[PDB]
């Protein structure tokens, strides 16, 4: 009975649709502006479903009114960046697209939970909130689960441990101003600081890893000639799951801050829980230095958001 | 310990890599000729693995010698057809690529099981056997599972039943001369003929379905502007699973015929079992009319396979 | 949000609860009459859930009113048979228990889909219908999927093939009068009759297999000193999945016949589809000899159902 | 091709077999001393495998020589449950199983589960003649799942990414480490500062973790079976897929945590080559508690060897 | 080619034969035990046929073997009640006659559809089923259509409307325990309850009408000194037409209940469809009070049916 609407049928959207089918999360509605594309991917997904013994319904469509009564909305519509570009270079063209999608969600399914993925991520979440007229808890963006996966992955490789239970908090905008928190990094519970004391990893090695984490999105673009699609989709699917199954998992994602971390009235990457009712920020006690870094990331997001609202007229 | 080598890091390869990681089938070796592309898709797949709690090793490489000691080899290297083209139009350019891959497999990992996917499928399997010097049971091509999934999917939709236990045999080349067998179609055990007698489906509706099955590959190209990727990858994975886990499953795939179905010395789509030791054809009793249709399909594959050998000089 | 209520917290109920947690099918309500048993198994299941990263809610209870608003009800309450006993020997004691459970479902959650499992299976489904006041499509019993799995498993072994795509129809009561249909047995689409023509299996070997399928329930009791628990639970879970996910799968189960197969006003093992709306019988064209065997099975179920109603006063 | 041998076909063994089938880990060999039991559970399990589309091979047997060439061995043989009788009755059984593994499949990776856990792992090592990295016992994972589950409930969070380290014997002398408890990376101490949980609530949780195994016996009238089996599976997975995951399990210490020549619950990585201990920097107070748990295990292990004559 | 056999050539049988001729329903076989009577009525009916241009064959006979290969059988054999008698007073004499007719139908034309009319109706249908060995859907009794005509006729008179499209359901035995359903009474689609709201008829007037409907059979006997013949024949002919022409019309008639309306293993007046395959009960949702009344009627039929079986030894 659950309806999952993918607004954008590109790489990310299709794989999200594929992952949703694998766990039987819901019926799919594959929407795109370009005719034929969602219908074709829907056909390929049905044949996939038939081989793997999944039976959920899959509808490829160019009529955005088919998004009606979606329980979940994943928004990937928009352009992606190429080599040499920053995420922020998409601000002009994607803001306009995000506004249009916001206006459509507003009239067709105002009760949905909305996961935004168009870049630049934090900014585009703010745009969606402005024109959608949905409650702020019902809107979020994925990024932090992606950036955390890259940072944990690298930490795991340097410590010669499984990535499976390397956990971390990354605060701030999905960009060059991310703030990975060493204090809030653990390896199956054990703080990262223990592994520095045991000489298994050095402060310099960690700064190196933080740098690779920041650039990773660009590095994949450079190597693969396309932007990361599998990891983003997995992250998204994890956030859909936490909503549908009322799991109340504690992630980083772009969420409405409201007095938390000295910030108010802005969607930005932060610690949050996701459950039945949406995405709910949680404030943890930062050090002065940590908070100072975070606030600096928050300032860019503020600026670039305003820039976006301006460029939309 | 199992090594799975994906020769070709395009759409199909990457998704196959994805599905192998989801079931922990083995460590991945992502190979492509184009520099950077495998390394980037490996990075994205690592991050995907970290988020889903899979821990297998993933290596993106341009050095084909990294394929050494692969247990499994999936070949997608080659060009894909565009709108208006037939699969057979690729014969010239893909034959040459398949030969080169054959030669590399020959010197680097002669003990592997080899699933060919490059088009036109049956033809390219015959090229790979010629220049690879591997036993014929250790080589096959995936197609029948994809064509079957399409046909069964359509049968299921018309009968208002789950596709989950709709099974069927499609013989012949992956092309316009497929031979779907009504007699060998069942719905959780019940032959298709019972549903015609019960007036739940008509002989004309079935012929319509057979036509859509034949043209499906082209239809997806037309709609999606790219060829099918998810369903092919799922089919491939199913054949990998049947080899690794010695399952002895009965599929249709491009296999070496040797006195079966009045055919010898040719890889062509047929009923086969896959296990530990490779792909083994099985002959079932066809009617005169069925065999005639099958022989006709076999003839095209014969011709076009000769053409492919000729055009390689 | 989905609530799955297990009326009976023995072996079968707990394993069904386990499988439902593995696929995230819903929140569990474990009910039993015996104090402390459901609470303890619930604790074990929560810890199991923690290890495997499942997060659904699990409540062990002795208050049957906790069953309120269950979407799904699985009934295993009742006594199981020992060595030397038939399923029919339980008629007296389990009929009374089934009536009590029927009455409780009637007042506490009349909108649920109800899978009966207490023996003798077909008879107890009829008892539940009588005292529950639920629509007949919302009530069924699992047996045919179990018997079919046994018969298909044995056929697969003899043919040296994967059981994975061996499908079959078994009609009739869950007992010595089952009617496995050779005509409706296939191996990945290929009818069983093709394998007899190819001399891979004989008519005698098939009769032997039918006999083992009939006695299997008793043979496991003899060997294991307890009745089968894992396969029953898997079957049950497969029917739950078909209902929750609106799959419309075609099984055999105990279902309300209404002019189908010359039978009316009786729950008995038959071919049926399960979807959103419940269990719906489907009639396939039987031969005279097949229908005669089926009618004979139906007659026992008739007699024994009457016996059960009589013994309830 | 992988062969998984379940020495003991009771509740735990069967469910382990069930979980192995669900992930296609390997062919099963179900062994028990009682005739008929394994054959019957094997039949059920084949039917279960048919319904769920798994195809691995399952053999029920009473001939221990069928254990030959097992890549993995899970030992649940023994009685569940005067303590000098437990340690008394199961020590003898464990020795007999050790001897059999010695002659029939010396290359196997061995997970011991018979109680009292730690003690019995040490008995297995003494009479099996297998390398010490190839032997371990599951217990930590189970105690950690209980503790993390309770923490998660109190904090109103998913248990999914609550991780923790619990050191020491599987018993009243467990040492849960608050410092090594996190919630998707965030240390438990941040939640006490935020007043989402109190030090007393934690001590309460530690106590319930210690008594859990008894509480389930009391309530269910049988010992826990589903969680133990999941734990065991998780270790099997880490070995077969060379995952190198960091668990707490009973493992051979050798200069780690001031302890040498003993199997005891400790932080370890499991891969292709077996279980390998890893030492983390404990505080004095933490190490003191851990040493105390290690002393019991020492004493009782001696007791066990003594009672075996 | 259709053969219609009238077992009993009294008033009803002859008139049924007349109506069947008028609509060309089939060739007639007029059977009676009394010599000469069927031959003489057959002569009169031939001459009737000649005048009205009907050309079906008509055979008057005392040899019951002439009933062979009848497609339809109408049983009016038996004694009719006089003034002061109930229908139940015939139980002794007619039960024995019905059994004898049952035995004859059994050996001479087991494939026929059988409409029983001898009184007391419901009881005598049950006797025929017991000794005939015919499927229960191939046996029914006419009564409800008669009682309905009477009730509808009286409703029409009081509302000053055509009886033509006044329809109703009357459940239960053909006797003093009939249950006419006000809820299931309509005037060309408009429920009876609309006419009470409009003050065109009162609840008391309706109860009066129900009473006259119950006693109508006796009132005609008192006035005409013979029992009703024209209406019974018309009703019978309507049930013949529905069978021959596969009309699937929804009547009330004595039909085999099998879990419908909390009743099993008894022929009693109920809602049913008549088609090619026979008479098939249909259960509609009754109120508690309606069902209670119906059950009470079913109880008498039960008792008297037992009485009938007893008196037959």
Residue numbers in the entry:
A (entry chain E), B (entry chain F), C (entry chain H), E (entry chain K): 1 to 313
D (entry chain G): 1 to 81, 86 to 313
Sentences from the paper on this structure:
PfMDH-WT crystals belonged to P1 space group and diffracted to 2.4 Å. Molecular replacement yielded a clear solution of 4 tetramers in the asymmetric unit with R/Rfree of 0,25/0,26, respectively. Similarly to other NAD-dependent dehydrogenases, the active sites are located in the cleft between two domains: an N-terminal cofactor-binding domain containing a parallel structure of first six beta-sheets (Rossmann-fold) and C-terminal substrate-binding domain. The oligomeric surfaces of PfMDH can be split into two major groups: AB and AC. These surfaces comprise 1852.9 Å2 (AB) and 1372.1 Å2 (AC), respectively. Active sites from subunits A and B mirror each other and are located in close proximity to the AB interface (but well separated from each other and interface residues) and distal to the AC interface. The AB interface is mainly formed by residues that belong to alpha helixes 1, 2, 5 and 8 from both subunits. The loop region between α6 and β8 of each subunit (residues 187–192) was found reaching in the hydrophobic pocket region between β7 and β10 of adjacent subunit, facilitating the AC oligomeric contact. Analysis of the crystal structure of PfMDH showed that AB assembly is highly similar to that of the active E. coli dimer. Significantly reduced specific activity, decreased thermal stability and a shift to a lower oligomeric state observed for PfMDH-V190W and PfMDH-E18W mutants suggest that tetrameric assembly of PfMDH is crucial for its catalytic activity, although the AC and AB interfaces are well separated from the active sites.
